[PDB]
Design a protein around this nucleic acid. Structure first.
Length: 363
RNA sequence: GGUCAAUUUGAAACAAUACAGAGAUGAUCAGCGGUUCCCCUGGAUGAACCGUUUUACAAAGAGAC
């Protein structure tokens, strides 16, 4: 997709102009996907961002430049060089928090867009459209490197082609193997290097701590190769003997896969001791993180942080699982939370099956 | 009992939390088959549910034939 290509910026709309009036003014130009309106800094006029379905619609809108709306002469232009990409804001930061950051440095924000957590609960970044290239460069100047709650903010002029390499990229790229069922005697970086370096250059070896120290029967290690072909061929070591131990070798799985399989175990659980310690909250937006939910439980419901064991998203049923420390606390939370308000919307509480039944009814 | 097998355990998931939009994903939430409900006059939908393809090793094993 290319949002920018079909998006235009409108400057100097009348104070009285709302999203609806913007639609009516421009809807003859072509079908519109989205409209945002924002006040100017001093509230004397309004800006609009209009995302058209197709490029021809954006072209048609631009023919309205220097036309008069009310008694305001508007300017319509391609939205370009006005988009920031931001990451590593705190886990509980909201769209409003980001908007307020820019407000503080006197930058008008037209649109702030956050990603779905559906397939990865940890996703955390945002796109922000401002009204000028100057404001965009100013946001980078003031906000890139800003420390917020211990997090060093990243703020960039948006260009996905320039994206940084993630620190976990080796796993994403299929270059990391996991070796399982090593004995403590074999849990030795030198031995692992000697046994695997024939396949290709080894970039890194990671051995989880505490394994020898706790005398584990089976130990694991991870090995990153400089290229994917070496890691693939190293899989031939699966089921091979190292000393007198048959080892397993596989491509390391990634976190979102592992995390989802954990949730699946819960959804399939029939252990009543376990089930009675949890509740589900639904329906919830798929943009809502466990951290945001935790903050809500602590600040609005006055639950203590340590009464909460874990929060897991179940976005396939528009919900989240909250695991508490006992069934009695869970039961009281069931009562308190049902019908409470979260993000301006009423939410329900219930069992896993209640959550599923509610979802099925909406479909 | 003899094969089949919810799950539990051996057992440690490292690597920096983030790190490029539903523009994301691996059955991670997939494909196919099959009964049900919805709406027509055997059919057309959508959804749910049930099986088959898929799955590192090892020990144990609710419950099934």
């Amino acid at each position: 997709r290319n949002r920018e290509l079909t998006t235009v910026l409108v400057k100097n709309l009348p104070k009285s102009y709302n999203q609806n009036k913007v639609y009516k003014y421009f809807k003859h130009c072509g079908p519109i996907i989205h409209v945002d309106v924002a006040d100017s800094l001093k509230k004397n006029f309004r800006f609009a961002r209009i995302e058209f379905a197709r490029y021809d619609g954006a072209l048609a809108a631009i023919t309205k430049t220097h036309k008069v709306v009310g008694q305001n002469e508007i300017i319509v232009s391609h939205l370009t060089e006005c988009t920031l990409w931001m990451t590593n804001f705190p886990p509980s930061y909201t769209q409003r928090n980001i908007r307020d950051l820019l407000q503080d440095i006197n930058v008008v924000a037209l649109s702030i867009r956050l990603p779905s957590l559906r397939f990865n609960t940890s996703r955390r970044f945002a796109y922000i459209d401002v009204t000028s290239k100057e404001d965009a460069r100013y946001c980078v100047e003031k906000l890139n490197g800003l420390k917020i709650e211990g997090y060093t903010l990243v703020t960039k002029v948006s260009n996905p082609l320039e994206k940084s390499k993630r620190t976990d990229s080796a796993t994403l790229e299929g270059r990391e193997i996991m070796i399982r069922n090593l004995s403590t005697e074999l849990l030795d970086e030198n031995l692992l290097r000697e046994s695997f370096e024939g396949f290709g250059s080894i970039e890194k070896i990671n051995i989880p701590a505490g394994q020898k120290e706790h005398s584990f029967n089976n130990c694991c290690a991870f090995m990153v190769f400089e290229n994917k072909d070496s890691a693939e061929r190293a899989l031939q070591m699966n089921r091979s003997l190292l000393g007198n131990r048959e080892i397993s070798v596989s491509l390391a799985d990634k976190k979102p896969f592992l995390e989802r399989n954990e949730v699946k175990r819960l959804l399939a659980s029939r252990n009543s001791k376990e089930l009675e310690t949890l509740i589900c909250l639904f329906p919830l937006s798929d943009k809502v993180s466990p951290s945001l939910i935790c903050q809500f439980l602590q600040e609005e419901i006055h639950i203590n942080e340590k009464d909460i064991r874990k929060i897991l998203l179940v976005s396939d049923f528009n919900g989240a699982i909250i695991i508490f420390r006992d069934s009695k606390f869970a039961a009281k939370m069931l009562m308190i939370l049902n019908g409470s308000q979260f993000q301006g919307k009423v939410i329900r509480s219930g069992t896993i099956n209640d959550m599923k039944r509610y979802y099925n009814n909406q479909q």
